[PDB]
Amino acid sequence: SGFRKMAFPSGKVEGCMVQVTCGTTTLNGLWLDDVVYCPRHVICTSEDMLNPNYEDLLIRKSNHNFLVQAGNVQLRVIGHSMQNCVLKLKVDTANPKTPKYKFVRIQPGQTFSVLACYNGSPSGVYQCAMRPNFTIKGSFLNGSCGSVGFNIDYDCVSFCYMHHMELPTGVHAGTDLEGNFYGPFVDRQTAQAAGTDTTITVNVLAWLYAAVINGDRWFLNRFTTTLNDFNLVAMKYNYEPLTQDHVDILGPLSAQTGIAVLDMCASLKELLQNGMNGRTILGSALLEDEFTPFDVVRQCSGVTFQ
Amino acid sequence: SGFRKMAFPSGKVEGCMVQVTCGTTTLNGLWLDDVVYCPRHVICTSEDMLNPNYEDLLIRKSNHNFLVQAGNVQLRVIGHSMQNCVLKLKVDTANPKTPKYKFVRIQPGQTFSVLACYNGSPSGVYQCAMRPNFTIKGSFLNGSCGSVGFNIDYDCVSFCYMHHMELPTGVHAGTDLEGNFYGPFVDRQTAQAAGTDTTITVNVLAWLYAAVINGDRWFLNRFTTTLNDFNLVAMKYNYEPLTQDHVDILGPLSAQTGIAVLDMCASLKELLQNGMNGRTILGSALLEDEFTPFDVVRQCSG
Numbered sequence: 001s002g003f004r005k006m007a008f009p010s011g012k013v014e015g016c017m018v019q020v021t022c023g024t025t026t027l028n029g030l031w032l033d034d035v036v037y038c039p040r041h042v043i044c045t046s047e048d049m050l051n052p053n054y055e056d057l058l059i060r061k062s063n064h065n066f067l068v069q070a071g072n073v074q075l076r077v078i079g080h081s082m083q084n085c086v087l088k089l090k091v092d093t094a095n096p097k098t099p100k101y102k103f104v105r106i107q108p109g110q111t112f113s114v115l116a117c118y119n120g121s122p123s124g125v126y127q128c129a130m131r132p133n134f135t136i137k138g139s140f141l142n143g144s145c146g147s148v149g150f151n152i153d154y155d156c157v158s159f160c161y162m163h164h165m166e167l168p169t170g171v172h173a174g175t176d177l178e179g180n181f182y183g184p185f186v187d188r189q190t191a192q193a194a195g196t197d198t199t200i201t202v203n204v205l206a207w208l209y210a211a212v213i214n215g216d217r218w219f220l221n222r223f224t225t226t227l228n229d230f231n232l233v234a235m236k237y238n239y240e241p242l243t244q245d246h247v248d249i250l251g252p253l254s255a256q257t258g259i260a261v262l263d264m265c266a267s268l269k270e271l272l273q274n275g276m277n278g279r280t281i282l283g284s285a286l287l288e289d290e291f292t293p294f295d296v297v298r299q300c301s302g303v304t305f306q
Numbered sequence: 307s308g309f310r311k312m313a314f315p316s317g318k319v320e321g322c323m324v325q326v327t328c329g330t331t332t333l334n335g336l337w338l339d340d341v342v343y344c345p346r347h348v349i350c351t352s353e354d355m356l357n358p359n360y361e362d363l364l365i366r367k368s369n370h371n372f373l374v375q376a377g378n379v380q381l382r383v384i385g386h387s388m389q390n391c392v393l394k395l396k397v398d399t400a401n402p403k404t405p406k407y408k409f410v411r412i413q414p415g416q417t418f419s420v421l422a423c424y425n426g427s428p429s430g431v432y433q434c435a436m437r438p439n440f441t442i443k444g445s446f447l448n449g450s451c452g453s454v455g456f457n458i459d460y461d462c463v464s465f466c467y468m469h470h471m472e473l474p475t476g477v478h479a480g481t482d483l484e485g486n487f488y489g490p491f492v493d494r495q496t497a498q499a500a501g502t503d504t505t506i507t508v509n510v511l512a513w514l515y516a517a518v519i520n521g522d523r524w525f526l527n528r529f530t531t532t533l534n535d536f537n538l539v540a541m542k543y544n545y546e547p548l549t550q551d552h553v554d555i556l557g558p559l560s561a562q563t564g565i566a567v568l569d570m571c572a573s574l575k576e577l578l579q580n581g582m583n584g585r586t587i588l589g590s591a592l593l594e595d596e597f598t599p600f601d602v603v604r605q606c607s608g
């Protein structure tokens with residue numbers, strides 16, 4: 001037993017991380033087959049990060065202006081193109097370590113693992129959620145751009161995030177691997193602010209089921225609630241509305257534990273209206289909303305990735 | 307910026323994980339060079355286990371009683387031996403993915419990453435601290451034994467932990483990679499309990515420095531304290547004593563932030579006695595103690 005904020009094993013992704021240098025700027029890229037994907041702002045200049053004309057800046061570049069390094073091995077760039085906010089650099093060498101992969105655009109409330117990298121070198125891994133305002137609360141320093149977020153299925157790596165910027169408040173914004181930002185953000189240093197960060201109600205209920213599975217039961221009560229009445233309380237604490245689709249995906253956890261979804265909702269309502277009274281749930285004093293129902297089942301059943 | 311509980315990349319270790327089966331018991335092994343390491347209780351029988359005599363149980367065992375699977379490939383065991391609480395299975399194939407590595411013994415308060423595995427395959431990775439009572443708060447199910455904890459330094463994988471058991475309250479115990487338990491525990495299903503848990507004071511202070519570096523400073527105050535007076539408060543809240551060596555170890559974080567160590571101790575004292583008054587620190591309502599001072603420097607600066 002036990003329940004931790006658990007990342008995917010990162011080995012498959014580590015083998016795809018490379019370093020891309022353009023002029024003075026160095027960041028990370030993702031090497032899949034004969035293409036390296038990286039944030040296009042690697043071509044920016046010191047005094048042109050406010051209104052960069054990326055089209056004009058790239059066409060004036062040549063293939064040799066992009067220095068791509070896979071560990072100590074140089075990769076010759078033999079083609080370069082722009083796709084939205086990411087750069088597709090074609091290399092003559094196909095990555096022997098390319099995993100079975102796909103590019104996916106995740107929904108708010110969904111979780112993924114971030115492999116933080118610097119100078120093409122993986123530095124650490126941690127679990128993140130796409131917030132309802134399309135930012136993530138990560139850990140990124142200068143040089144971390146190009147680090148990716150991902151999920152794993154069976155043997156297939158689903159890449160969903162590439163890191164581009166940090167907004168004031170220490171929150172992070174990025175794109176999918178098609179180069180399109182999550183949320184309304186743009187890759188220039190003009191004033192931008194994230195929207196309302198609400199709590200992911202379906203994830204909190206999943207984590208409450210994880211608690212029960214692992215022995216924490218003090219918050220269970222003999223009350224029930226209607227979905228209508230729960231949402232009226234939820235809205236007042238800036239929680240996402242719980243929908244029928246959310247009730248459905250909580251089904252399996254409800255069945256494994258014998259606690260009906262609306263009974264767990266009654267417990268969550270009580271916690272919201274009265275707090276924890278100095279007690280803790282899975283070692284937390286706050287209600288955790290960065291585990292999905294599938295994350296809970298994944299960890300509590302011990303599914304592995306070959 | 308930002309501050310997260312961060313694990314090491316697990317790829318160097320994934321390449322070392324194998325499956326070991328004896329009878330009907332299956333767990334994980336660590337394949338390094340031509341040797342596979344695993345907990346010795348792989349050789350227990352369901353109806354023994356309360357009080358196994360491992361010497362006696364090895365009387366029967368032959369090499370071929372140990373089935374080792376590296377992914378799909380089957381490894382042939384050509385020799386076995388017991389060292390402390392681990393088995394050393396000699397196989398005829400050296401692991402071509404063996405990293406540069408060493409075995410290290412960590413001390414309470416130090417942190418490490420765990421790659422949780424089942425049937426020799428990875429499930430997930432997370433960061434743990436060796437508690438003062440020589441347990442860790444992990445996430446381990448049946449079949450997870452043999453999963454290892456590690457750090458990565460430069461290009462060297464420093465293995466420090468191998469999982470063996472769970473005590474009630476969901477706390478976890480294991481050995482170093484030489485086979486010697488952390489703490490007073492034995493690999494036997496007789497009643498055992500960890501000492502009462504205490505908080506790793508030097509780590510909380512390091513995390514408070516991380517908070518300042520990342521912009522959270524509402525808890526800084528105008529008071530100071532002495533090392534003695536702070537430890538009077540620590541003791542009453544079940545915090546570990548803070549020593550002059552701890553103060554020294556926190557020096558570099560104190561110099562980076564401009565906040566003397568005993569001034570941060572005064573902040574911590576006020577948090578212990580008054581709470582957070584509805585506020586959070588680095589997104590937490592509780593004082594976090596699973597980041598060492600080195601962990602903070604690493605994450606906040608390369």
Ligand SMILES: *[C@H](O)[C@H](CC(C)C)NC(=O)[C@H](CC(C)C)NC(=O)[C@H](CC(C)C)NC(=O)OCc1ccccc1
Nearest residue numbers: 041140141143144145164165166187188189190191192
């Ligand atoms: C890439 O490695 C790096 C990672 C960050 C964690 C720093 N990102 C950038 O350098 C990025 C480059 C631009 C051209 C996309 N810029 C930012 O992320 C930037 C950082 C601040 C601290 C200057 N933030 C930013 O431009 O946000 C928009 C903004 C501007 C002005 C006021 C408020 C918000």
Ligand SMILES: *[C@H](O)[C@H](CC(C)C)NC(=O)[C@H](CC(C)C)NC(=O)[C@H](CC(C)C)NC(=O)OCc1ccccc1
Nearest residue numbers: 347446447449450451470471472493494495496497498
């Ligand atoms: C290995 O895969 C597995 C991982 C655990 C997370 C289940 N560990 C064991 O099977 C281990 C084997 C013994 C011989 C060392 N046993 C335990 O860890 C056992 C688990 C419980 C569920 C029985 N713990 C144990 O025996 O703790 C001591 C104890 C015994 C009786 C009463 C209180 C405490």
Ligand SMILES: [Cl-]
Nearest residue numbers: 285286591592
């Ligand atoms: Cl908390």
